[PDB]
Amino acid sequence: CSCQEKWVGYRCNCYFISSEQKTWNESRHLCASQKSSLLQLQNTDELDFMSSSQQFYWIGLSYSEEHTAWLWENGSALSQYLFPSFETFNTKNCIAYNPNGNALDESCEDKNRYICKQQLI
Numbered sequence: 001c002s003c004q005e006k007w008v009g010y011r012c013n014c015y016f017i018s019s020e021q022k023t024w025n026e027s028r029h030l031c032a033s034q035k036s037s038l039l040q041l042q043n044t045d046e047l048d049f050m051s052s053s054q055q056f057y058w059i060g061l062s063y064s065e066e067h068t069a070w071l072w073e074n075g076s077a078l079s080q081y082l083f084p085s086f087e088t089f090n091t092k093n094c095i096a097y098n099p100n101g102n103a104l105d106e107s108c109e110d111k112n113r114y115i116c117k118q119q120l121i
Helices: 026-033
Strands: 008-010 011-019 057-064 069-073 093-097 103-107 113-117
Touching: 026 113, 057 113, 069 103
Parallel strands: none
Antiparallel strands: 008 011, 011 113, 057 069, 057 093, 093 103
């Protein structure tokens, strides 16, 4: 399950954990730019390794008034028991996440780091 240059492999998946801080719509595009996409958490334990990092990251979850629901990049709804805070998330924000499970919602125009992930050959 080999991956491209500065990409990290785990569970036969390729992840990209950026150093630069960008906008959620940018990163969104940078990942897309690389045939990958703004992280869709298949579960809280997707980043075992990064286990501690006390910093948040941008992820592919964003609200969507058209389906009155939070959605991942491919349009799957957000599981209600995934993130707990859930109900707090101010629909006008993006979702930032922390390897240790914690997750925030900050202006989609802030400047956090991003995480792309190539999932299927």
